[PDB]
Amino acid sequence: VQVIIKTSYPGQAPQIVENQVTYPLTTTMLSVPGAKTVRGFSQFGDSYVY
Amino acid sequence: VIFEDGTDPYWARSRVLEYLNQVQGKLPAGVSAELGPDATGVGWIYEYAL
């Protein structure tokens, strides 16, 4: 069981996707009650957060 | 935001959220609306100093 949060970011390198999207998402998710762990995927073009 | 004593906490939190969604854009330049933690005025368990 998990909640998925995908954010698309065209033509952006994995690193930039991380800092612009994945970072603020994951870090601020650390404090959502019930969250055992938080997965962050920074692919070139997309941001899959679990 | 105070509720009628007895009501489910997360209900209240998931309740206030809908009227905080439409008030986010109305907020100044870059000030954000931070929601209280999933704890009360006793959660203060362990304190330390570096």
E-state strands within chain B: none
Query: What CA–CA distance (Å, rounded) separates B32 from A42?
Result: 25
Q: Which residues in chain A have their CB less than 8 angstroms from residue B37's CB?
A: 31
Contacts of A33 in chain B (CB under 8 A): 10, 38
The technique is X-ray
Cβ of A10 under 8 Å from any chain B Cβ?
Answer: no
Interatomic CA distance for residues B8 and B3, integer angstroms: 9
Do the strands A5-8 and A40-43 form a parallel or antiparallel pair, or are they unpaired?
unpaired
Resolution of this deposited model, Å = 3.7
Instruction: Answer whether B32 touches A (CB < 8 Å).
Output: no
Phi, psi of A7, deg, nearest 5: -125, 115
Beta bridge mates, A5: A49
Interface contact A31-B10, CB threshold 8 A: no
| Contact in structure between A26 and A49 (CB atoms under 8 Å) | yes
